[model samples]
Target: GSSGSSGEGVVEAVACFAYTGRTAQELSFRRGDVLRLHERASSDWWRGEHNGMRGLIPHKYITLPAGTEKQVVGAG
Candidate 1:
């Protein structure tokens, strides 16, 4: 099949957070860890897989396209 599903989406870690302050599983990720991102919407939290570990991580902490350029106003 020529479907463009490309399987589950993948993204890279833009920021690092151990989730130590949360009750959920603490995902160990650096500033450039590749994760298998599950399809989700209308949700602030997201499910991801890394190093054979699956857990809930913040959606805002990663990128969709992976390594997407960021733009901020009035900032160096």
Candidate 2:
């Protein structure tokens, strides 16, 4: 396969809270941790991977990518 677009259709999210998984199929993440979301399990849960582990995570615990830069509107 040719390397045109690397890691296509992948989404990046930042963990907002430190959550510990209660089940073996769930993934735990600390605050400020970056996660790679491969697919959405549900509206409340997302299927993502942290570090080298894959599991489910709460959607509320992760902040999905929106805007990276900030702009100033008013001059002082």
Candidate 3:
């Protein structure tokens, strides 16, 4: 992750990963921010990794923006 200090002294981390949605408009991603997807019933959590450490994540604490459908990808 890349870190940059905002003029206000806030540090933000940026990273990239793969995300799949039924429609392009549904793919809501902003560069340099953490995006997380989770399995149904909060069973697992997923982290995005570009050509590196990637896999499922526990469902606890994982949340998707409103109106977003659930999606899942196999182990990296």
Candidate 4:
């Protein structure tokens, strides 16, 4: 089963960071594409399952319907 913020959710890409080179395993996505976000703990990068590939996405490039009473660093 899933745990923490690691669950199914629609993540709207505010910015797109296209994958560069096919030299190695890398992750990339485009803006307006809905990505399935898994974890919200990694302050800088967010784990997302996209097009059958999982990789790190820039946290600031996405937004979630999440909230908290406490101040979370790097999150608004």
Candidate 5:
């Protein structure tokens, strides 16, 4: 629903700021993690839904790795 980019064809990987040309942090994310890029009106951070927990992450804190693609199989 946004013009920036779509995760619909990208594979999930450990979140890393380096992918987006940002400084690195101590945080690490695994593959297949569901991330919610919330609207700025709700919060100024990204929400990650992973391992059955929700946490607020800085918008520029994490990023997707290179050559990542999301594959959706089957018809909905």
Candidate 6:
């Protein structure tokens, strides 16, 4: 009953930092790149699709459905 929404779209994550893949099985992206999430593979890694390719990505380097945010510093 909860699945009543008509809009269906892919869920995604945004890269907050650029990470170069250490091996062939990993995926790399630049900051602000939006990656379509495939699955949460592990606590530290996640599967995603980008540039028509799929690979493992660092889970901590991305933010869910939005870009990363930081606290604003002000001079007193």
- Strongest candidate by TM-score: 2
Indicate the residue-level lDDT of 71 in model 2: 45
Report residue 53 deviation for candidate 5 (angstroms): 0.5
lDDT of 6 by residue, 1-76 (tens): 3343545545588888998778878888999998877666787888777786678888788878643223355548
Query: Candidate 1, which segments miss by more than 4 Å at Cα?
Result: 1-21, 24-26, 66-76
Off by over 4 Å in 2: 1-7, 67-76
TM-score of each: 0.49, 0.72, 0.27, 0.50, 0.32, 0.68
Best by lDDT: 2
Please write out the lDDT profile of model 2 over residues 19-74, one tens digit for every residue: 88788799998899988888778868888877778899888888888952234455
Residue 33 in candidate 5, Cα distance off native in Å: 5.8
- What value of lDDT does candidate 3 attain over all alpha carbons? 0.35
What are the RMSD figures for all models against the true structure? 7.4, 7.7, 15.5, 6.4, 10.6, 8.1
Better of 1 and 4 by TM-score: 4
**How do the residues 4-74 of candidate 4 rate in per-residue lDDT, one tens digit apiece?**
46345554444444443232233566765666655554766666667777676666655554462234456
**Candidate 2 residue pairs in clash (backbone atoms < 3 Å):** none
- Tell me which of candidates 2 and 5 scores higher on TM-score: 2
| lDDT (Cα, tens digit) per residue for candidate 5, span 1-76 | 2344534442233443432213332223443343553322223344444445444455454454564224444456
Instruction: For candidate 6, list the clashing residue pairs, or say none.
Output: none
> Candidate 6 has what TM-score?
0.68
Quick one: how many clashes does candidate 2 have?
A: 0
Residue 53, model 4: lDDT of 74
TM-score of candidate 2 to 2 decimals: 0.72
Q: What lDDT is reached at residue 68 by model 1?
A: 44
Query: Per TM-score, what order, best first?
Result: 2, 6, 4, 1, 5, 3
